[PDB]
Write an enzyme that holds these catalytic residues in place. Structure first.
Site, PDB file in Angstrom:
ATOM      1  N   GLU B  36     -11.140  -3.332  -0.815  1.00  0.00           N
ATOM      2  CA  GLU B  36     -11.174  -3.905   0.513  1.00  0.00           C
ATOM      3  C   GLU B  36     -11.381  -2.817   1.547  1.00  0.00           C
ATOM      4  O   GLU B  36     -10.972  -1.658   1.360  1.00  0.00           O
ATOM      5  CB  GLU B  36      -9.899  -4.720   0.789  1.00  0.00           C
ATOM      6  N   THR B  65      -6.489  -5.551   7.060  1.00  0.00           N
ATOM      7  CA  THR B  65      -6.107  -5.544   8.481  1.00  0.00           C
ATOM      8  C   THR B  65      -6.765  -6.713   9.239  1.00  0.00           C
ATOM      9  O   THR B  65      -7.288  -6.566  10.365  1.00  0.00           O
ATOM     10  CB  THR B  65      -6.396  -4.166   9.147  1.00  0.00           C
ATOM     11  N   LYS B 125       1.943  -8.881  -0.433  1.00  0.00           N
ATOM     12  CA  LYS B 125       1.884  -7.436  -0.261  1.00  0.00           C
ATOM     13  C   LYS B 125       3.199  -7.068   0.421  1.00  0.00           C
ATOM     14  O   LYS B 125       3.544  -7.655   1.434  1.00  0.00           O
ATOM     15  CB  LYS B 125       0.644  -7.063   0.600  1.00  0.00           C
ATOM     16  N   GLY B 155       2.688   4.329   0.552  1.00  0.00           N
ATOM     17  CA  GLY B 155       3.299   5.447  -0.183  1.00  0.00           C
ATOM     18  C   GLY B 155       3.403   5.285  -1.703  1.00  0.00           C
ATOM     19  O   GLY B 155       4.342   5.807  -2.327  1.00  0.00           O
ATOM     20  N   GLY B 175      -4.004   3.217  -0.442  1.00  0.00           N
ATOM     21  CA  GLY B 175      -4.710   3.558   0.788  1.00  0.00           C
ATOM     22  C   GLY B 175      -4.987   5.044   0.869  1.00  0.00           C
ATOM     23  O   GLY B 175      -5.808   5.567   0.113  1.00  0.00           O
ATOM     24  N   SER B 176      -4.277   5.713   1.775  1.00  0.00           N
ATOM     25  CA  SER B 176      -4.462   7.139   2.057  1.00  0.00           C
ATOM     26  C   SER B 176      -4.372   8.047   0.824  1.00  0.00           C
ATOM     27  O   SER B 176      -4.986   9.103   0.797  1.00  0.00           O
ATOM     28  CB  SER B 176      -3.442   7.607   3.096  1.00  0.00           C
TER      29      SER B 176
END
Ligand SMILES: *C(C[C@@H](O)[C@H](O)COP(=O)(O)O)C(=O)O
Ligand SMILES: *C(C[C@@H](O)[C@H](O)COP(=O)(O)O)C(=O)O
Ligand SMILES: *C(C[C@@H](O)[C@H](O)COP(=O)(O)O)C(=O)O
EC number: 4.1.2.21
Lengths: 205, 205, 205
Positions: B36, B65, B125, B155, B175-176
């Site tokens: 996504e 988002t 989620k 995280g 994600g990150s």
């Protein structure tokens, strides 16, 4: 952005009318330019209008723990410029915005933050931040609109302030670690000095 | 159950249209089958339809988002199959469900989870999971309906993925720790390999 | 205040009708005077009315994981005196209050707590407390009305009970650490003895 010089909010929970002017004068003298008195403080409808009148042109003056729309109305008349809350209540936020007051309402989750934004909030309080940590805010900042100022409130100390600012907080609301009901004016001046110092060093670093 | 082979969602926040195809091809090549692009990524209305068209039949393709009902409408037309959110917004969920899209909306509390279920969410989620920990999900799973798939997001690392799966997560959104805006395609292939490896070893263990 | 002698709630998730009377008799014998059976327990509509009838005049008897208004109606007829929830759902709370039942609904944020109060809740469950910690409750207690009883639920042990009580909890709901589905009656009597002992020592200390 937050529209006051230093982004720290002095929260004086449980302060009484006879001590309000001295303790507020302490925090302002040390460098604060936002101060609020929670509505669960005794005789707040005496203390707040007094501080608006003595300090309203020296600092952003307002109220905390604002839970009912009708309190916003009363506070507007008193000359409150700032509304802080522990929770997101859409009509409180909308009403305070409707007076041109600065609102910094309290949320704890993404869902609650976006509800507060939709009510017109221009800034957010994460409360209590201590349970979540700096990383929580960092994670929230990856979804929040870029120009929303986020304030850590709850277990923020002059020692850990740096880590909140690093994580993406525009500033912090300081309660018990700054003022506890019945401490001396000298203690208020000491803690406020410590926080201002910690903030300035945090930006520098 | 989650209806895709490996229950990992690649979240590529801040990816640009010119890099979308290569980075998505990297994650899919490594074993991902859900990807996504957050709507706070630049020119997402270029990247998303491109990836649907290149990869829509190789992976569950969608958006993150997603904050407004009208975005769901736009994304449906683009051929989005997956809607991920940071928050619970009932009409977003209902609308996405109404298109036969897979929705994995973000909640952080029991109250919010049951609101999302009532909006028709078939998966949840927990965001951001890092503040709460694996035990939070374990505690939530004791009240959630048995067939609701819970995804840790926030995280999650290839090192800690095991503990999320042990705690009861059906999978994770990454994600990150998988993709940060401006990293190389080679870094995306490296991190995606690590997560797939970590997941496979987690099931084994 | 909580209106039962000892402020501990025995939560017997997954207990079956044939074991309900013995395990409830164990907890009550050890000193508990509030007991609830979650509605995700098998054949709860057999176990609950049985325990109301055997123990309703010896302890506060009720149900947990109450998610729908219509369940409140059914439970009232069964003679339930207590409604516990994992979430805040205003009509559940209002309906249970409307029967003169004791409601202890579950919230996790300030916003959710004030919603539950506005629905008529006289007590609050912080769930799951383990993720947040004692300090979370201490922070919540600085904004909640003074007479609202706060119960920690989630990862409370006879060893850590003290710290919840110190932080401002009026009491605790005890689940898996007291009863897990399929443990012996002797284990229930052992854990219940431990919690009662831990509570009594906590007040003393
Ligand atoms: C927000 C809540 C805040 O004022 C509380 O006092 C928690 O902060 P501390 O832990 O005391 O620093 C409000 O009152 O609106
Ligand atoms: C959900 C939020 C998620 O995508 C954030 O990026 C947090 O995850 P990481 O910490 O980056 O792993 C959404 O966008 O819908
Ligand atoms: C409230 C939720 C509670 O009963 C859960 O079982 C969590 O507690 P433990 O971790 O098991 O102690 C409800 O069911 O209403």
């Amino acid at each position: 952005q937050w529209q006051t010089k230093l982004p720290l909010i002095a929260i004086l929970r449980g302060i009484t009318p006879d001590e309000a002017l001295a303790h507020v004068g302490a925090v302002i003298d040390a460098g604060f330019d936002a101060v609020e008195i929670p509505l669960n403080s005794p005789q707040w409808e005496q203390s707040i209008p007094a501080i608006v009148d003595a300090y309203g042109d020296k600092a952003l003056i307002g109220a905390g723990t604002v839970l009912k729309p009708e309190q916003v109305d009363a506070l507007a008349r008193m000359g409150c410029q700032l509304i802080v809350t522990p929770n997101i209540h859409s009509e409180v936020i909308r009403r305070a915005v409707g007076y041109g007051m600065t609102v910094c309402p309290g949320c704890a989750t993404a869902t609650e933050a976006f509800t507060a934004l939709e009510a017109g909030a221009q800034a957010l309080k994460i409360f209590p931040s201590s349970a979540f940590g700096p990383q929580y805010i960092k994670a929230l900042k990856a979804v929040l609109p870029s120009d929303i100022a986020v304030f850590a409130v709850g277990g923020v100390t002059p020692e850990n302030l740096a880590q909140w600012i690093d994580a993406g907080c525009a500033g912090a609301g300081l309660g018990s670690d700054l003022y506890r009901a019945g401490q001396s004016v000298e203690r208020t001046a000491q803690q406020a000095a410590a926080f201002v110092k910690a903030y300035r060093e945090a930006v520098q670093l």
